[PDB]
Enzyme design. Structure first.
Site, PDB file in Angstrom:
ATOM      1  N   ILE A  11       0.828  -1.199   0.000  1.00 11.90           N
ATOM      2  CA  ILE A  11       0.000   0.000   0.000  1.00 11.90           C
ATOM      3  C   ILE A  11       0.866   1.254   0.000  1.00 11.90           C
ATOM      4  CG2 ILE A  11      -1.666   1.317   1.389  1.00 11.90           C
ATOM      5  CD1 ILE A  11      -3.055  -1.325   1.952  1.00 11.90           C
ATOM      6  N   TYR A  19      -2.932  -6.550  16.809  1.00 10.02           N
ATOM      7  CA  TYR A  19      -3.038  -5.738  15.604  1.00 10.02           C
ATOM      8  C   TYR A  19      -4.265  -4.847  15.659  1.00 10.02           C
ATOM      9  CZ  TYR A  19      -3.844  -4.430  10.745  1.00 10.02           C
ATOM     10  OH  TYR A  19      -4.089  -3.737   9.574  1.00 10.02           O
TER      11      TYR A  19
HETATM   12  N1  LIG Z   1      -2.974  -5.252   3.244  1.00  9.55           N
HETATM   13  C1  LIG Z   1      -4.167  -5.016   3.803  1.00  9.55           C
HETATM   14  O1  LIG Z   1      -5.201  -5.653   3.497  1.00  9.55           O
HETATM   15  C2  LIG Z   1      -4.261  -3.916   4.816  1.00  9.55           C
HETATM   16  C3  LIG Z   1      -5.512  -3.681   5.385  1.00  9.55           C
HETATM   17  C4  LIG Z   1      -5.675  -2.660   6.302  1.00  9.55           C
HETATM   18  C5  LIG Z   1      -4.590  -1.892   6.653  1.00  9.55           C
HETATM   19  N2  LIG Z   1      -3.382  -2.140   6.107  1.00  9.55           N
HETATM   20  C6  LIG Z   1      -2.199  -1.311   6.581  1.00  9.55           C
HETATM   21  O2  LIG Z   1      -1.554  -0.769   5.461  1.00  9.55           O
HETATM   22  C7  LIG Z   1      -0.141  -0.645   5.739  1.00  9.55           C
HETATM   23  C8  LIG Z   1       0.644  -1.338   4.661  1.00  9.55           C
HETATM   24  O3  LIG Z   1       0.125  -2.676   4.519  1.00  9.55           O
HETATM   25  P1  LIG Z   1       0.626  -3.591   3.315  1.00  9.55           P
HETATM   26  O4  LIG Z   1      -0.302  -4.739   3.183  1.00  9.55           O
HETATM   27  O5  LIG Z   1       0.894  -2.742   2.132  1.00  9.55           O
HETATM   28  O6  LIG Z   1       2.020  -4.070   3.927  1.00  9.55           O
HETATM   29  P2  LIG Z   1       3.395  -4.556   3.289  1.00  9.55           P
HETATM   30  O7  LIG Z   1       4.041  -5.544   4.192  1.00  9.55           O
HETATM   31  O8  LIG Z   1       3.052  -5.191   1.934  1.00  9.55           O
HETATM   32  O9  LIG Z   1       4.328  -3.238   3.150  1.00  9.55           O
HETATM   33  C9  LIG Z   1       4.654  -2.520   4.357  1.00  9.55           C
HETATM   34  C10 LIG Z   1       5.918  -1.735   4.143  1.00  9.55           C
HETATM   35  O10 LIG Z   1       6.282  -1.086   5.383  1.00  9.55           O
HETATM   36  C11 LIG Z   1       7.654  -1.301   5.627  1.00  9.55           C
HETATM   37  N3  LIG Z   1       7.888  -1.246   7.062  1.00  9.55           N
HETATM   38  C12 LIG Z   1       7.561  -2.208   7.980  1.00  9.55           C
HETATM   39  N4  LIG Z   1       7.993  -1.959   9.192  1.00  9.55           N
HETATM   40  C13 LIG Z   1       8.644  -0.742   9.065  1.00  9.55           C
HETATM   41  C14 LIG Z   1       9.357   0.051   9.983  1.00  9.55           C
HETATM   42  N5  LIG Z   1       9.542  -0.280  11.262  1.00  9.55           N
HETATM   43  N6  LIG Z   1       9.905   1.200   9.530  1.00  9.55           N
HETATM   44  C15 LIG Z   1       9.740   1.525   8.243  1.00  9.55           C
HETATM   45  N7  LIG Z   1       9.095   0.854   7.282  1.00  9.55           N
HETATM   46  C16 LIG Z   1       8.575  -0.282   7.760  1.00  9.55           C
HETATM   47  C17 LIG Z   1       7.950  -2.663   5.012  1.00  9.55           C
HETATM   48  O11 LIG Z   1       9.349  -2.857   4.835  1.00  9.55           O
HETATM   49  C18 LIG Z   1       7.135  -2.569   3.717  1.00  9.55           C
HETATM   50  O12 LIG Z   1       7.850  -1.931   2.666  1.00  9.55           O
HETATM   51  C19 LIG Z   1       0.067  -1.211   7.140  1.00  9.55           C
HETATM   52  O13 LIG Z   1       0.116  -0.132   8.056  1.00  9.55           O
HETATM   53  C20 LIG Z   1      -1.154  -2.118   7.323  1.00  9.55           C
HETATM   54  O14 LIG Z   1      -1.562  -2.294   8.673  1.00  9.55           O
HETATM   55  C21 LIG Z   1      -3.197  -3.119   5.200  1.00  9.55           C
HETATM   56  O1  LIG Z   2      -7.559  -6.164   7.492  1.00 10.79           O
HETATM   57  C1  LIG Z   2      -6.390  -5.919   7.808  1.00 10.79           C
HETATM   58  O2  LIG Z   2      -6.018  -4.995   8.664  1.00 10.79           O
HETATM   59  C2  LIG Z   2      -5.248  -6.676   7.207  1.00 10.79           C
HETATM   60  C3  LIG Z   2      -3.973  -6.095   7.200  1.00 10.79           C
HETATM   61  C4  LIG Z   2      -2.914  -6.779   6.632  1.00 10.79           C
HETATM   62  C5  LIG Z   2      -3.112  -8.028   6.083  1.00 10.79           C
HETATM   63  C6  LIG Z   2      -4.362  -8.626   6.089  1.00 10.79           C
HETATM   64  C7  LIG Z   2      -5.447  -7.958   6.646  1.00 10.79           C
HETATM   65  O3  LIG Z   2      -6.666  -8.571   6.627  1.00 10.79           O
END
Ligand SMILES: NC(=O)c1ccc[n+]([C@@H]2O[C@H](COP(=O)([O-])OP(=O)(O)OC[C@H]3O[C@@H](n4cnc5c(N)ncnc54)[C@H](O)[C@@H]3O)[C@@H](O)[C@H]2O)c1
Ligand SMILES: O=C(O)c1ccccc1O
Ligand SMILES: NC(=O)c1ccc[n+]([C@@H]2O[C@H](COP(=O)([O-])OP(=O)(O)OC[C@H]3O[C@@H](n4cnc5c(N)ncnc54)[C@H](O)[C@@H]3O)[C@@H](O)[C@H]2O)c1
Ligand SMILES: NC(=O)c1ccc[n+]([C@@H]2O[C@H](COP(=O)([O-])OP(=O)(O)OC[C@H]3O[C@@H](n4cnc5c(N)ncnc54)[C@H](O)[C@@H]3O)[C@@H](O)[C@H]2O)c1
Ligand SMILES: NC(=O)c1ccc[n+]([C@@H]2O[C@H](COP(=O)([O-])OP(=O)(O)OC[C@H]3O[C@@H](n4cnc5c(N)ncnc54)[C@H](O)[C@@H]3O)[C@@H](O)[C@H]2O)c1
Ligand SMILES: O=C(O)c1ccccc1O
Ligand SMILES: O=C(O)c1ccccc1O
Ligand SMILES: O=C(O)c1ccccc1O
Lengths: 268, 268, 268, 268
Positions: D18, D151
């Protein structure tokens, strides 16, 4: 702008206030905009000023006007991508005993059933285009408002019906969302304030109701609408708040005729 | 009263304020109440006044205190039916640049992780009894609060964690709910007001924040807790608002240092 | 029970289902209960079974029936402390193009305007008693429901109007709250399931919709109502969820006619 | 694109998923984007691919990394208009008794305190620019999630803290908002699914959780972020749902180890 280029958009109540804000925002994005309004003055003015905006006289409480609006939009433009149900009215302040079931009914015809009728007739065409619906509710649907029992009820209905439609229409890919504006500076806001003993004091209380310290503008709701239609393809059934933060934090809620004890008996 | 007769209830922070309100409400319902508090003065006073209330000295941020509290409650009473996570603190007003990550961490230990640790250790026993958990969050978790970024964050966490636990524990029939009180007149409220340049004016603004025109009482949160534990068997993961309507309607939200234009430029 | 002893309570639609649950709960608390129902069969049965429950034939969509109900309750009992607006109907599943504006209007007369009319006529008496109003909305007002656009809209209206009334009536100390039940096992639920190709499969999906794994009972809504009226004196304008957690966590939401790609193209 | 031309934007966790979606969306709008990530691989790749995107190695749990990130952004670019707190982690499924207070603490350092520390250091510069903050929370903060107590708690905290900051910063005109994505198809989603006995079945349940029938894409969250920063000037403290409607309507919520009676005893 090209974010909604060539899409066909109907905006009810598009002749002034928030509706005109939305109309300009969609025209700016490249859409064909059908301004629907019961008042010809403001709409024909927009129609002449904005090419690609077109005015069609239509009272949304008159089922035939809406069939004709829909019938003319397809005949004239061959498609329908977006319906912004904005036509609505807020009565002057009224205590519950100052409302009548008749007034309530009339207000539901406009605020709720007008939105429902256009959506029903538009859905067969929105399904073909994989279009979307945007309803203009209000923040008071969510948190209530003093002296506005009928109005609040119609807006609670619009927000809930938006979610019901989003479920019914997701199998077709038709998104259905609403915007809940807080205090937006519009002619309606101005007309209502002018009924008060101190209009400008009332407007000032309207601005102080927001942490941001001002009312919103129609253009800002218009941007929110264009975002919903053109860039929120994973959004359906959401309530997008355009309120300046009015719903946040504590505020002065005990009313000027509400008995309040002195601060030495804080909890009764 | 017999609505919760012989159930074993643990109330953290039960020595004064809202915790003592809850303790009296459960004792009144016939429960065995284990008062958990880090301060012995208020708790031992309740223990002596209310038979069937018992005091166990315990800081919920000290994992051993909580293991010992849980260990003693089962040893002493053979069961555990209800955990009311109430221990919590609200720091004096602080702007964001007046908070430190260290202070934030300390506040999470109490408001969030203390609630989490007792719940973890209590769940094996609550599963056997088909008991329930009640967390005392706050309305500001839901709508925010000025000058309280750490506190608001911990309460947003408590309310969300309540829903997570409700899902994790519904297969066992263990309900998990929270109460979100608005302004409740308590020693903590009094202590915080006393730090203000005008305490009584501040208390008055606290009362005016409710449409009802007063703050709540600990007894009223206590009734809400006893209802959740004893009569809400189809409720889990809910947020029960005890707020006097504070979240409703428009109010004075633009702050005393927030630039606000005059009412002739209402929307900027 | 004595938590609501001698208070005078009107329950619309009190003749069966959730209304009868509420009637028994208030009788159990010691109240005088006026059962209001359009069907005499179920109500007169309760009237004969429960002394202190009394049946008055009344269709809440008929303004004269409601004036007479109110007029008779004061004449017969000298006061009015609590109005539980429960009368309501859920039509069989209907897609948007299977609804008519006429059906929508009829449904608003019952679900919304019936609740509004009784409240208007009751408020002068509730003000004297410092009473309260309890409206029975629904969780689908808050999160929507498939194939129920009119019903969802009326329940969105009830929940919002509850907040509007809470603001209008807090200066008098009259609380106004609503209960939003999720899936409650009632004759109405049974009648609707019986219209389905597989009733018991449909009932099973109703139970699986809750993390708790069952539907609620009328008695559990009745307890929630008695709590609101008798012990929630700092609650106004709240939406009390009696839903078994249905609104929580992820679930199976993509419908049986909704195109879904295979899990190798997860996001389109 | 020119909707955010020349504004300076920091995106934490911008190296993939994201965060990278948001980075591309802001670059596309004309901004200067500082990619902050603890992993150099994905970020330096974006830095080389997207001119005007720049990578700065930084772990947001390391207060010095964040001071240096902020210090370098101002030194290198002379201003700071927008902070998108996106860095976050979702642990593998864990029952409550499979979590430790230590793990919870570590997760709060990243998901909550990392967001808090960057915001604290950024606010003096955002005040000068009249900038805004965008936090990436999650829908499970609002409705809970199974097997994710830590979480969910951190995301409940982020959403609430967003509202607290919006109040604290509105006197400066600094907006503070959050996006709550539902199921977004990302490497993190893929990595978590791969830990399951049937990854593709799990991904399929992820898609069926939305009425729209798919997961969202990072680009769609990126559009939501660019809208918040560039066109939502009357929005502060809002929670923008990017969820495909997951929170709407009834679904399959009773879990595969949750005792459920047969449909002949529907309500226990
Ligand atoms: N994927 C989903 O369905 C989803 C749903 C709701 C919320 N989110 C939120 O969106 C954000 C990104 O999710 P995603 O699925 O893209 O994750 P991801 O794992 O695919 O990417 C996350 C990125 O953050 C970086 N990161 C992690 N820890 C870090 C730190 N301590 N310092 C700096 N960078 C750091 C990672 O290296 C990576 O590049 C998160 O905050 C997650 O909780 C995701
Ligand atoms: O719904 C979320 O917060 C979520 C976040 C990261 C990965 C899978 C997930 O369902
Ligand atoms: N102004 C606010 O602060 C505010 C706040 C929340 C919601 N809203 C909603 O936004 C919408 C517009 O509000 P506004 O302040 O811009 O109002 P407005 O009075 O300034 O403009 C409303 C427009 O709708 C038209 N209209 C009214 N009844 C109609 C009918 N039956 N058929 C067709 N057109 C009709 C009017 O002629 C007018 O052009 C309404 O639905 C209102 O409830 C406004
Ligand atoms: N007072 C309000 O208006 C209000 C509003 C919303 C929420 N709340 C919440 O209600 C709870 C009680 O608030 P109150 O106003 O009654 O507070 P209070 O200060 O009057 O009483 C709190 C009690 O908790 C005890 N306690 C504190 N830290 C503890 C620890 N580490 N271990 C064990 N016990 C501990 C204190 O010794 C005290 O007896 C808190 O969780 C607070 O956040 C209060
Ligand atoms: N059953 C559920 O799962 C459920 C869920 C959410 C909300 N509700 C609400 O709860 C209420 C009761 O639901 P139920 O399932 O117990 O229904 P029900 O059909 O089992 O009972 C409703 C009662 O209201 C009476 N009634 C109907 N129309 C009336 C009118 N015009 N005037 C007077 N009385 C009238 C009926 O005769 C009946 O006695 C309704 O308002 C419904 O929307 C029910
Ligand atoms: O908040 C509203 O819904 C509203 C609508 C129109 C005019 C003034 C208002 O406050
Ligand atoms: O609203 C709160 O959370 C609160 C808690 C404790 C003291 C004063 C308060 O306003
Ligand atoms: O959820 C509802 O509102 C409902 C009401 C009546 C019958 C079945 C239902 O699901």
């Amino acid at each position: 702008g090209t974010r909604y280029a060539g899409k066909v958009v109907v905006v009810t109540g598009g002749g002034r206030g928030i509706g005109a804000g939305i109309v300009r925002a969609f025209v700016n994005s490249g859409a064909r905009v059908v301004i629907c309004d019961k008042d010809e003055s403001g709409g024909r003015a927009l129609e002449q000023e904005l090419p690609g905006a077109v005015f069609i006289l239509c009272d949304v409480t008159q089922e035939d006007d809406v069939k004709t609006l829909v019938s003319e939009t397809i005949r004239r433009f061959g498609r329908l991508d977006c319906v912004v149900n904005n036509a609505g009215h807020h009565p002057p302040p009224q205590r519950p005993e100052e409302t009548s079931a008749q007034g309530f009914r009339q207000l539901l015809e406009l605020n709720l059933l007008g939105t429902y009728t256009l959506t029903k007739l538009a859905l067969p065409y929105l399904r073909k285009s994989q279009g979307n619906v945007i309803n203009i509710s209000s923040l008071v649907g969510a948190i209530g408002q003093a002296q506005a029992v009928p109005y609040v009820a119609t807006k609670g209905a619009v927000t809930a019906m938006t979610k019901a439609l989003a479920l019914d229409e997701s199998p077709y890919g038709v998104r259905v969302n609403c915007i809940s504006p807080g205090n937006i500076w519009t002619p309606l806001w101005e007309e209502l304030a002018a009924l008060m003993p101190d209009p400008r004091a009332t407007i000032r209380e309207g601005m102080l109701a927001q942490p941001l310290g001002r009312m919103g503008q129609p253009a800002e709701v218009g941007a929110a609408a264009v975002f919903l239609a053109s860039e929120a393809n994973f959004c359906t059934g959401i309530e997008l708040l355009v309120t300046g933060g009015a719903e946040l934090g504590y505020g002065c809620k005990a009313s000027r005729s509400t008995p309040v004890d002195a601060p030495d008996i804080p909890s009764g």
